[PDB]
Copies of this chain bind each other. A is one copy, B any other.
């Protein structure tokens, strides 16, 4: 129903998206601006744009900069930061900014910006090859999961760029995988219970805590064709997402 548009100027990101994801979803290699211009020859449709930002709402670089240019520059940034309460928002949070208030700056079919801080400030990458899990796989998944969970149900399409793949410095190979996983859970709809999705996330993030693996979910894995042994030993650095969410689903 809701179209998901993955947009990014880095072909490495777009190529990786093509590989890890099975209409309902579209991939666009190129600038957001052009995708927007391109978004004027179809409906002759309201969207929300996920933007990986900083904890303060400044839009001085990366994807945020495209948003800054496209929506009115420095007055828009000023307005934007005020919508966020002008204060610190933690990485792990997500805030929807309604552009409808433009009527009090309006443009195209974009009504929302889902602000998801990926860095406190771009003073240094968040990534550390010593632990690609805590500084890569996990933060990207969380940012994607929150953006999806916060997506207004009234929109026609959701525009999302690579997350943490710019100033945050997370390798695309790592980010794309977590984005693909979050999206795969979301697209599984009700074919997988919420509880089982919770369990799949827990093992994907390598937190093998048995007490949080209910028997009902074990029965559901057997019914869905998910190998429980491989689930309990899922290694985010070597195993395919398919082992958690079979495409047959």
Chain A interface residues toward B at CB < 8 A: 54-56, 58, 60, 85-88, 90-93, 119-124, 128, 130-131, 134-135, 138, 142, 145-146, 149, 194-195, 197-198, 201-202, 205, 207-209, 211-212
Contacts and interface: CB of A to CB of B under 8 A. Distances in A.
Contacts of A124: 207
A194 B84 CA distance: 12
B58 A194 contact: no
Contacts of A134: 134-135
A55 B207 CA distance: 11
Contact of A208 (B60, B123, B149, B205): B123
- Protomer copies: 2
21 contacts: A54-B212, A86-B194, A87-B197, A87-B198, A88-B145, A88-B197, A90-B92, A90-B142, A92-B93, A93-B146, A119-B207, A120-B138, A120-B201, A120-B202, A121-B202, A121-B207, A122-B209, A123-B209, A124-B207, A130-B130, A134-B134
A195 B86 contact: yes
A58 B88 contact: no
Contacts of A197: 87-88
Contacts of A198: 56, 86-88
B90 A145 contact: yes
B90 A146 contact: yes
A208 B120 CA distance: 10
A100 B40 CA distance: 49
A119 B130 CA distance: 20
A202 B196 CA distance: 38
Contact of A92 (B123, B142, B207): B142
Contacts of A56: 198, 202, 212
A58 B199 CA distance: 13
A47 to B, nearest CB: 24
A205 B85 CA distance: 20
A181 to B, nearest CB: 12
